[model samples]
Target: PPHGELQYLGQIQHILRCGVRKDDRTGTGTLSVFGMQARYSLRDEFPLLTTKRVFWKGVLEELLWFIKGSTNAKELSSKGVKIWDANGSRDFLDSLGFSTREEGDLGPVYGFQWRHFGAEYRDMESDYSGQGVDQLQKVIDTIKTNPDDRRIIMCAWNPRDLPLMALPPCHALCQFYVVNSELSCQLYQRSGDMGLGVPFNIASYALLTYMIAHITGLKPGDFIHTLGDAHIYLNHIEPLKIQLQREPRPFPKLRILRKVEKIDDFKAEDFQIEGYNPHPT
Candidate 1:
């Protein structure tokens, strides 16, 4: 939330508040307003901030969808959701002579790897089959038995899929760590367009950690981000200027809208934000 400085995270954390801003590419680069960081026990009801509205259901459902090994352009299309439109997943598989059964999510990329990766890919399916297998399942298992291992990692970037992808993964790699049964996560982004991608990065991974903790039977902890090429787009500079002029109101409220039993219990249409007193869209 803080603009251009690592110290901003400290500032917001100091007051137990998080920062917010509007980023519409060539972003405003504005560090708009500050508000109290709403805390929740992710193990109980999830740590999703009730301050500003976020698409929590879409966020989680999208994660589950990815868990299905789908990177098709139409992956989340069933929900009328389109975040990055990185349809390269289906394109990547198709280029490699793979085809979807029906028109369903094109190719099952994430799920295929995390669930049945090595088997799904041609060369990897030999004696090396399932040797280094399902990424998400591995993480969940580690959290159960090897919770202390700091190397707990799940990667979405597959070099083999690169040539076939319509667009490469931005939220590339992430690691999980736990302390006193509290789940914490750190995400490593090789590339991110600051104004647009960064916000989604924070929102997406934070919620991902929240859900992961729930399934692993743990409480909410911290979500840290390690960035490499995080920067503002050329266009967002002006909107940030306007943000500097306005006074930030209290953070908006977020509602989950249901009792989530499993990860898939969440959906995009189930999210709503109230009391968002911003200037205007």
Candidate 2:
């Protein structure tokens, strides 16, 4: 079988060869395809892409931020992960018709929708300790108590909260499955930026699956990524062409140094990537 990274490269090549030109919200043109899917194994090796260096710290910190149910981008920025900083900027918020909202407030983005689904989102600073559905906890509980349950799902796309958000959720929903004590996740991303965002999305969800499996006493299984509109921005076409030329190296293994009793109990220090050798940026 081809390596998991090879699957990603194949998708990119497919896009370059057969994608249709389409305009986007960013005003940048894209070579887009309607649907795509890729399955990545998490048996022992982590699927952090090796064709180009992925910001591992950013992935870890941003995910940790989401797990904490924080909607403030400044909190993530404080950890030196500035991926959400632009979206939460004052000017950007104003442009999005969120002028009344406080700066850095992302207004019920991924974290809020994950931890407190259907709860009233007053502001980024409001304490929603017991509010909403707590889907993350529920998923973990379902895994431990009833691994065969088909309803283990986490959804971030809330239509009622769409207008209030800094940006709509792209990686919208995910469902978990367990078979013979192994946990697997399938993420449904409504829109995927194949060059930049898809790589990060793959690593992010795989890490999330690993974390959930660790706390639930199950072995990490596969991460199945299903996309709706997968596209490569026109500017990224040249760079990805170069990336496709590089051979995929051995995928690294993720080492969890400490025993995490709960999903929320995981800290950045508790986890480490053992042998992540990637191509230069």
Candidate 3:
């Protein structure tokens, strides 16, 4: 079996060789590819990159915020999740006619789509009726009662809610499959920035699968990551080559010590990464 970081590194090399040079909206050029895939086994390692540093706390805070169906960026930043800060900036929201920039509210983003998708959304201050399909809850229920059901999927792409979102979902669709006592997940990322975004996506979705499996009472299984428009910016080309030269350290194991039956009850503190050593990216 190939190493997790090696798969990622190999994909980067593949893109440099086979990808087409294309112009992008940022005015930065890219060596872009239309499709790519990678697989990782959770049973073997946690899949946190040993090739570079990843911010796990931010990852957890964002994931927890999504699980709670929150659109408030303030709530995340309060808990040390700064990744959403730029997108939820005061000027950005004001330009969009969002008068109340309280807590840097990102109007109905990933979590809103996951929990209350397709619901009629008003301003950020108003409360949703919770009338829309609770895809996350429904999938959990399905896993509990009927693991064999083919429809155990969570989708973040809601056409109705897209215009109101701070940014449309990139890592949008996710599906789960159960075999025996193990639960596996596959994620579809509609767009990916290979150097900057893809690693975070991998860790984020992998943790999501791990959490869901715990509550569903199944062993964590493989994570299959599929990408669209996986690319490296021209500026990132040289830096990535420096990364390729470094050796991949052994991957870490994620430990969930708490016995939380509910997915929402699992706090970030409940999880720990053991034996992680990596080169600086």
Name the candidate that leads on TM-score: 2
lDDT for each candidate structure = 0.54, 0.92, 0.84
Models, CA RMSD each: 8.0, 0.9, 1.5
Tens-digit lDDT track of model 3 for 1-281: 56778889999999999989987766778999988999988895788887778888878778988998888777788897778888788788777776565547788788778877788766556677566788888999998999999988999888877767778889789999998888999999988888878888889989998899888899989999999888989989998898988888888988889888887686888889889887864
Per-residue lDDT tens digits of candidate 1, residues 161-205? 554334456667788889997998887776554444454556677
Off by over 4 Å in 1: 1-58, 84-111, 120-132, 244-279
Summing lDDT over every window of 10 consecutive residues in candidate 3, give the lowest-scoring window: 122-131
Q: Report the poorest 10 consecutive residues by lDDT, candidate 1.
A: 32-41
Best by lDDT: 2
Candidates 1 and 2 compared: the better one by lDDT is 2
> Model 2: clashing residue pairs?
none
Better of 1 and 3 by lDDT: 3
